Amino acid sequence: PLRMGGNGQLQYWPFSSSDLYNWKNNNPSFSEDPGKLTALIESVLTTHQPTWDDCQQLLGTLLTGEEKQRVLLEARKAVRGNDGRPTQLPNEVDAAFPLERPDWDYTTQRGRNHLVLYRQLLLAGMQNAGR
Amino acid sequence: PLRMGGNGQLQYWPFSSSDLYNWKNNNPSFSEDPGKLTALIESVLTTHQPTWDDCQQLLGTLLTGEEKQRVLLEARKAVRGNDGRPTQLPNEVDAAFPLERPDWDYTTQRGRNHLVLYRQLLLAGMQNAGR
Amino acid sequence: PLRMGGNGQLQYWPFSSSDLYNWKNNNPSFSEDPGKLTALIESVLTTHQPTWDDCQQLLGTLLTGEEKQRVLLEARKAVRGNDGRPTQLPNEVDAAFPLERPDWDYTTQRGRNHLVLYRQLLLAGMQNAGR
Amino acid sequence: PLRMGGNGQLQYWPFSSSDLYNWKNNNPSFSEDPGKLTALIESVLTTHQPTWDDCQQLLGTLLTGEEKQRVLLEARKAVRGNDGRPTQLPNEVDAAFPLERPDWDYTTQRGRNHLVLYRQLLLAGMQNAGR
Amino acid sequence: PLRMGGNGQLQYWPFSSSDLYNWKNNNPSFSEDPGKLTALIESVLTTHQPTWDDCQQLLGTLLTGEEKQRVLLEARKAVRGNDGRPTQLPNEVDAAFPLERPDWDYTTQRGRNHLVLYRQLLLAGMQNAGR
Amino acid sequence: PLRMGGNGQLQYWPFSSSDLYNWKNNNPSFSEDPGKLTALIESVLTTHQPTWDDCQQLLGTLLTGEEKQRVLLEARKAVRGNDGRPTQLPNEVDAAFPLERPDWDYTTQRGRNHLVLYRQLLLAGMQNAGR
């Protein structure tokens, strides 16, 4: 998670495992009722401002292997080029929604913008995988 | 939640899931007995000074979709104009009780003021929805 | 709760729900054995230095509605005037033990003094209600 | 509890109820096996550097009313006059081991000295009450 | 765990036992399904930035002695020289993946670089042992 | 526990009871399988840098009275003198592995060194008692 520190600088801390497991245990599986976890994750993406690694823990903990895969491919399918249209260009897809750890630095506007987009695409992925 | 920090400045931390689920598990549903969750949320709105996002999280966890919709509707119906009378002017309803994430900056007096009003309206909404 | 922070600043944090429910679960009800919760709350009023809102949360959680109302009624009957003698003057009663949220600021000496007095009266009210 | 802060300034924080109840739940009653809670409290008196209020809370949670009264009685019997010999003079007994909240300020050397003595006497009291 | 604070200060805190045991309790053994604990540990290596001591504690808690010994053996088999080439010269293996506590200092680039390398080799070791 | 602050000053905090009881509850007794608790304590001695008092809580919580006494006996039997050779001279044994609370100031070289030695001897005691 990230939060704005008292000094005007973002501050990082890892998710407590109790939160992750509580979220899991108080909801149906994604397959049973996708709306439940999707709404929970949409909320957390905002309040907890997760990094890319944090998102991997969210997904890894709340979804099964098969569910996560569906979501990730759905998220990559939601990437748009600069012309606002879908794109399947590897470099564009990889840049927006990387499958391997990116070098995004949350102390930079560049890093922050990628994080914003990543979270937006993650949500889209879940919404579409649910449907 | 927001709390005043060491430098007389508001600091933010997300709700602990243990608190949210403890609140859920120790009270009847809103439909079952609205007074209990209403009183709890009234209290939490003050002690935890939640942001707009926190409020969506609080509500989404403690109320069903059906219940929350009812609550948000009553809240918007309780908005008053500068003449102390009910107002249905969309711009005024939306400015006081937005249904989508507003740009309220809690470090500013204006955002702080919007948050106090949002919380009062939410409470009025729960009270009215309860009746 | 309030505590003296590291910059000679009084610092606020909300009660943990785990503490509130643990206190309820490990004691008989106020009606069953008033002495137990009275002693617990007496202690907490000092160790946790609760604000007026904290006190409402505390009482609202540990006492039933009828119990709480009895306690507040008795607290208000235990107000004294500036001569140190009992008073029933509504203005002195409302100033020392408001039933609605006061404008008390814990960063001011006046607010702090009001809080010390409010907690003292709350204890008196619990003792008298118990008896 | 008290701990030395960064600048050698003691900082106060109240006991977590989870610690108090875990200690209770993982030991026999004082009456069943005095040495158990005695050793636990002895240790806490050092690691947590409790204030007078903390001590009341610790004893009030872990001992029954009757057990606690016996401990406080034995503690008071262990008070010594300035000559290092037993004293039963009420002014001396009350200054060293007050039954009512004293005005000790842990930010002063004298308040600190009073607390050290109080804890020492409390341990003696438990030891002797145990016998 | 290590986290970055203020304006760049690394800060150490030991793992919470609740986290370690939750991780253990919500996953199959390494021998039953290596990919699960592997993915979890890989994630933790990044989010919690564990020291060498932390890594021993993490492995010791989540893997049996046999499993842990296999992982460390494989990590050591995957050591490379500074030039990127594989090496099994004893001194270079020991420098990159020590079996005994090293004197790495996280306030120096040399220390931080050693820890980053250790975690990388640990991951490789788990993957290989898993295979 | 002790940890290093950014300014190089050690900072003390007491063990959470949740950690101590979790350690106890997730492991066999020392008499059952000495290796388990021994390894656990070995790890805690490093990550948590416990003081003498902390070590008493670890031992007193994780071991039975008989086991603890046996561990302390073995630790004291393992003491070495100024020559690095074994010694059983009372003053040297009591200085290295005191049974009563010592005056070790962790801000001094001498105090830190006594602590490191105490922890090493505690581990030796456990290993030897296990055998």
Coordinates of N, CA, C and O in Angstrom, one line a residue, chain D residues 3-8 13 18-19 22-23 26-27 36 40 42-44 46-48, chain F residues 7 9 11-18 21 24-25 51 53-54 56-57 65 101 106:
Chain D
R3 N 7.7 3.8 27.6 CA 9.0 3.4 27.0 C 9.8 4.7 26.7 O 9.2 5.7 26.6
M4 N 11.1 4.5 26.7 CA 12.0 5.6 26.4 C 11.9 6.0 24.9 O 12.2 5.1 24.1
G5 N 11.5 7.2 24.6 CA 11.5 7.6 23.2 C 12.8 8.1 22.7 O 13.8 8.1 23.4
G6 N 12.9 8.4 21.4 CA 14.1 8.8 20.7 C 15.0 9.8 21.5 O 16.2 9.7 21.5
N7 N 14.3 10.8 22.1 CA 15.0 11.9 22.8 C 15.1 11.6 24.4 O 15.2 12.6 25.1
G8 N 15.0 10.4 24.8 CA 15.1 10.1 26.2 C 13.9 10.5 27.0 O 13.8 10.5 28.2
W13 N 1.7 4.8 26.2 CA 0.6 4.2 25.4 C -0.2 3.2 26.3 O 0.5 2.5 27.1
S18 N -5.8 -7.0 24.0 CA -5.4 -8.4 23.6 C -4.3 -8.9 24.4 O -4.3 -10.1 24.7
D19 N -3.3 -8.1 24.8 CA -2.3 -8.5 25.7 C -2.9 -8.9 27.1 O -2.6 -9.9 27.6
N22 N -4.9 -12.1 26.8 CA -4.0 -13.2 26.5 C -3.3 -13.7 27.7 O -3.2 -14.9 28.0
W23 N -2.8 -12.7 28.5 CA -2.1 -13.1 29.8 C -3.1 -13.8 30.7 O -2.8 -14.8 31.3
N26 N -4.0 -17.4 29.3 CA -2.9 -18.4 29.3 C -2.3 -18.8 30.6 O -1.3 -19.4 30.6
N27 N -2.9 -18.4 31.7 CA -2.5 -18.7 33.0 C -3.6 -19.1 33.9 O -4.8 -18.7 33.7
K36 N 2.5 -18.2 38.9 CA 2.3 -18.0 37.5 C 2.0 -16.5 37.2 O 2.8 -15.9 36.5
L40 N 4.5 -13.4 35.7 CA 4.1 -12.7 34.5 C 4.0 -11.2 34.8 O 4.6 -10.4 34.1
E42 N 5.4 -9.5 37.4 CA 6.7 -9.1 37.7 C 7.5 -8.7 36.4 O 8.1 -7.6 36.3
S43 N 7.4 -9.5 35.4 CA 8.1 -9.3 34.2 C 7.5 -8.0 33.5 O 8.3 -7.1 33.0
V44 N 6.2 -8.0 33.4 CA 5.5 -6.8 32.8 C 5.8 -5.5 33.5 O 6.0 -4.5 32.8
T46 N 8.5 -4.6 34.6 CA 9.7 -4.1 34.0 C 9.6 -3.8 32.5 O 9.8 -2.7 32.0
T47 N 9.2 -4.8 31.7 CA 9.2 -4.5 30.2 C 8.2 -3.4 29.8 O 8.4 -2.7 28.8
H48 N 7.1 -3.3 30.5 CA 6.0 -2.3 30.1 C 6.0 -1.1 30.9 O 5.3 -0.1 30.6
Chain F
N7 N 18.7 7.4 13.4 CA 19.8 8.1 13.9 C 20.8 7.3 14.7 O 21.7 7.8 15.4
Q9 N 20.3 5.2 17.2 CA 20.0 4.9 18.6 C 19.1 3.7 18.6 O 18.2 3.5 17.8
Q11 N 16.1 1.4 19.9 CA 14.7 1.7 20.4 C 14.2 0.5 20.9 O 14.2 -0.6 20.3
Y12 N 13.6 0.5 22.2 CA 13.1 -0.7 22.8 C 11.5 -0.7 22.8 O 10.9 0.3 22.9
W13 N 11.0 -1.9 22.5 CA 9.6 -2.1 22.7 C 9.4 -3.5 23.2 O 10.1 -4.4 22.9
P14 N 8.3 -3.8 24.0 CA 8.1 -5.1 24.6 C 7.5 -6.0 23.5 O 6.8 -5.6 22.6
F15 N 7.7 -7.3 23.7 CA 7.1 -8.3 22.8 C 5.6 -8.2 22.9 O 5.0 -7.9 23.9
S16 N 5.0 -8.3 21.7 CA 3.5 -8.5 21.7 C 3.2 -9.9 22.3 O 3.9 -10.9 22.0
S17 N 2.2 -10.0 23.1 CA 1.8 -11.4 23.6 C 1.4 -12.3 22.5 O 1.5 -13.5 22.5
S18 N 0.8 -11.7 21.4 CA 0.4 -12.5 20.3 C 1.5 -13.3 19.7 O 1.4 -14.4 19.3
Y21 N 2.7 -16.1 22.2 CA 1.7 -17.3 22.3 C 1.7 -18.0 20.9 O 1.5 -19.2 20.9
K24 N 4.6 -20.3 20.9 CA 4.3 -21.4 21.7 C 3.3 -22.4 21.0 O 3.6 -23.6 21.0
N25 N 2.3 -21.8 20.5 CA 1.2 -22.7 20.0 C 1.5 -23.3 18.6 O 0.8 -24.3 18.2
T51 N 16.3 -8.0 25.2 CA 17.0 -7.6 26.4 C 17.0 -8.8 27.4 O 16.4 -9.9 27.1
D53 N 15.4 -9.0 30.2 CA 14.0 -9.2 30.5 C 13.2 -9.8 29.4 O 12.4 -10.7 29.7
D54 N 13.4 -9.4 28.2 CA 12.7 -10.0 27.1 C 13.0 -11.5 27.1 O 12.2 -12.3 26.8
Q56 N 13.6 -13.4 29.5 CA 12.9 -14.1 30.5 C 11.5 -14.4 30.1 O 10.9 -15.4 30.4
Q57 N 10.9 -13.5 29.3 CA 9.6 -13.7 28.8 C 9.5 -14.8 27.7 O 8.6 -15.5 27.6
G65 N 8.4 -24.5 33.7 CA 9.3 -24.2 34.8 C 10.5 -25.2 34.8 O 11.6 -24.7 35.0
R101 N 18.1 -9.7 37.5 CA 18.2 -8.7 36.5 C 19.5 -7.9 36.7 O 19.8 -7.4 37.7
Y106 N 22.1 -0.9 27.2 CA 22.3 -1.3 25.8 C 22.8 -0.1 24.9 O 23.1 -0.3 23.7

